Amino acid sequence: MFENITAAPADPILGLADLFRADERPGKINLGIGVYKDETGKTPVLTSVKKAEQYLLENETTKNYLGIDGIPEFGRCTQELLFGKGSALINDKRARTAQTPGGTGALRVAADFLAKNTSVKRVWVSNPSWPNHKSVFNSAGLEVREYAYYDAENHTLDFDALINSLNEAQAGDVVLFHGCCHNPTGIDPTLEQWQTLAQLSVEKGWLPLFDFAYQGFARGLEEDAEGLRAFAAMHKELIVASSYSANFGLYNERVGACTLVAADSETVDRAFSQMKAAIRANYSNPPAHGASVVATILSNDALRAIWEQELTDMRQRIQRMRQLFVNTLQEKGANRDFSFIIKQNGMFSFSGLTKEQVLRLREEFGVYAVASGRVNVAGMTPDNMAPLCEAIVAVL
Amino acid sequence: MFENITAAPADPILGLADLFRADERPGKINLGIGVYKDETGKTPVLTSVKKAEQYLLENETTKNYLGIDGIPEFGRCTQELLFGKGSALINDKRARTAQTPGGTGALRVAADFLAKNTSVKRVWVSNPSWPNHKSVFNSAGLEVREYAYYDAENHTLDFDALINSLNEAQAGDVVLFHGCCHNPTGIDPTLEQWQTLAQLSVEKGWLPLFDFAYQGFARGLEEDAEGLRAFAAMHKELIVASSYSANFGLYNERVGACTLVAADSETVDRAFSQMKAAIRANYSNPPAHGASVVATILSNDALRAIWEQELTDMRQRIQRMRQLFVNTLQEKGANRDFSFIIKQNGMFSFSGLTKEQVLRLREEFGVYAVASGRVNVAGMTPDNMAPLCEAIVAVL
Numbered sequence A, B: 001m002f003e004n005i006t007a008a009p010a011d012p013i014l015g016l017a018d019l020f021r022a023d024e025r026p027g028k029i030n031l032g033i034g035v036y037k038d039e040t041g042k043t044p045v046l047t048s049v050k051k052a053e054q055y056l057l058e059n060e061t062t063k064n065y066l067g068i069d070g071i072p073e074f075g076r077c078t079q080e081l082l083f084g085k086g087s088a089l090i091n092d093k094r095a096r097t098a099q100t101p102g103g104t105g106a107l108r109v110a111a112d113f114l115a116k117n118t119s120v121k122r123v124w125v126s127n128p129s130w131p132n133h134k135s136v137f138n139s140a141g142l143e144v145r146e147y148a149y150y151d152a153e154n155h156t157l158d159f160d161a162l163i164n165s166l167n168e169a170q171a172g173d174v175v176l177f178h179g180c181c182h183n184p185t186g187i188d189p190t191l192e193q194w195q196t197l198a199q200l201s202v203e204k205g206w207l208p209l210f211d212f213a214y215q216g217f218a219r220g221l222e223e224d225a226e227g228l229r230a231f232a233a234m235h236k237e238l239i240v241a242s243s244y245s246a247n248f249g250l251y252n253e254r255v256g257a258c259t260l261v262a263a264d265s266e267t268v269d270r271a272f273s274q275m276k277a278a279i280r281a282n283y284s285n286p287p288a289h290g291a292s293v294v295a296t297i298l299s300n301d302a303l304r305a306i307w308e309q310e311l312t313d314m315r316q317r318i319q320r321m322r323q324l325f326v327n328t329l330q331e332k333g334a335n336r337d338f339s340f341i342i343k344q345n346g347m348f349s350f351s352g353l354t355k356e357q358v359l360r361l362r363e364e365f366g367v368y369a370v371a372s373g374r375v376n377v378a379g380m381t382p383d384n385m386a387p388l389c390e391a392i393v394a395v396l
């Protein structure tokens, strides 16, 4: 009985997946990508990293087990890059980070850490979200709530439905708040707004989650750990989950990490000690290839300088490309102020296609959306601009 | 509240850990290692793999997300090497394997796969075990039982306490039975013995777990997937968990995989589909560096031939070294037939040190055991033989 009467299906990420090249033709693109891509639409390897995969093929003297907390060089710049550089919060000794098989893999380690030590029973998320989010958050029974910004039409943040939809539950409760701007809505609380809700993370109670994948890829690097920081010399307890998978040409090989923080180097050596057990049951100690090629890039000024331009570029085209989609419709389409997209950050963003508009594209079209209205501006190109600009019209 | 009144400590694997080089001196060795090591006691990188880490530094064209089931070349030889080569069970289409962050990381994915689909509430293990075993098996509430061989004195398998301690519970129940010979007792049911209990996995009910790390490293490669197979054209349902981490100079970077098998390519496309969700919440898709450097070694006759001698050698010294410890005591010690060790396989094996004998070594000795009587014959050398042969006497 691993056999009969099961049940079965689909992460709404197959959502185009294969069915995309399926039928064979000018497939615009499954704008609904899990990734960046160039004015070529190749998800490259980078260099900076390649530049280091040599360095470790050169001196990788062994390959013995790794501690269940990876490596804190990976850890210290993780640290340094989150909280930021100078904070003696860093040398307050009051946050630790283990290595973790990136993104979604650090949030689940958060979940059983959190079933224990923590007397929590839930996490309120955000509507719309990341659909693996309510899933790696159901792990320790823990059910998710849906707080509520992005109320649409001016596709812009309902501070309102939020503080409100938010304020709503219990002290011992967990919110989840991703770094800058969003999946599926490269949206956001500005400074004063981040600023606004922390006075509220505070007395209300809460305690922040903080999914931070995409970090400084959707922002110049900097408004990013402000997003977070602002909510940091403000708190007392928090849990940040990160992932270098995107921002580094790193996935495949699971990279980022989970960081615990408290007021006491006593309280955090402690909570962390149990956390180091959440892990010990999953994978027992990290996918090491990753950490290394990230500690290295990160601890090399020559190498860190190759990487940082690579990232910078990578931004160029989501700041830049984002614009494009819009003038082209300013020159065809012509049914709305598609401005939003242009300045509404990240490589993700939803649109006015009541699904049905989008079941449509797939068609004797060959456009591939995410039946939520979400497109990876990342799959949008110089070459596609055009047709994809014209796919849509007839769709309205 | 991620802060006060927690709880906290120690996987009984720190058990020497650091405290070993601690005090500074002729440290014999923390015979209680998590790994192999040479007549040097360096846990090398190999070559064969190194030979391929070049091949992928050469053609690693991208590095996009990996499917949540890794790669089935990794998968097909995983397959082929488990069940074995020829079985059209293979082309019965009736077992699938996902990639997984090795060993302990495939057994936990087994656990939540198994909470679902499966209406199971427990796994009976083996006494003595692998202490992360009852831990990555408590995940989905699921508590572990302790079945019971290795009754001691002739340190050899109690078929008896077993079939018996075994037969004991319920149909819908899970046993766990590691591949050949053991941690901490490179022990074992011979062929007829493996042979014996399957007639019993069968009508009794059960359904095998099968932790298979160490595979063909403790045996010439071959009696190994016999261990398993014997129990294979015999069953109907099973769950095998593997790890190339040892046998390949691969850990650090989490490698092996979890394999589901059924009678129907219908039933197994199905159970697997849900299994592909256990995972989707943990790490979301595998530590890819691993699979690749293992599919490659495995699909290259030139390269597979470098690796297979590397493994062969690697055996040489557990067949060979195992002997050694014994004649040396045949020439000093002289208080028992320490034969057992010599032929009682793997790189692990327990001894007649009521702990206390071993709290002892640590001493104005500098020997480091595992306070269970377990020593990694793997840490035993030409050079150490000697002193370590003489550490013990005074211990008795």
Ligand SMILES: Cc1ncc(COP(=O)(O)O)c(CN)c1O
Pocket (backbone or CB within 6 Å): A101, A102, A103, A104, A105, A130, A178, A183, A211, A213, A242, A243, A244, A245, A251, A256, B284
């Ligand atoms: C909000 C969010 N969280 C977590 C992840 C996890 O991704 P990864 O594990 O590769 O970083 C993603 C992936 N894009 C994401 O969008």
Ligand SMILES: Cc1ncc(COP(=O)(O)O)c(CN)c1O
Pocket (backbone or CB within 6 Å): A284, B101, B102, B103, B104, B105, B130, B178, B183, B211, B213, B242, B243, B244, B245, B251, B256
């Ligand atoms: C019985 C057993 N099971 C699982 C593991 C997991 O190890 P790994 O994840 O590196 O293969 C080990 C490690 N030696 C083990 O001994």
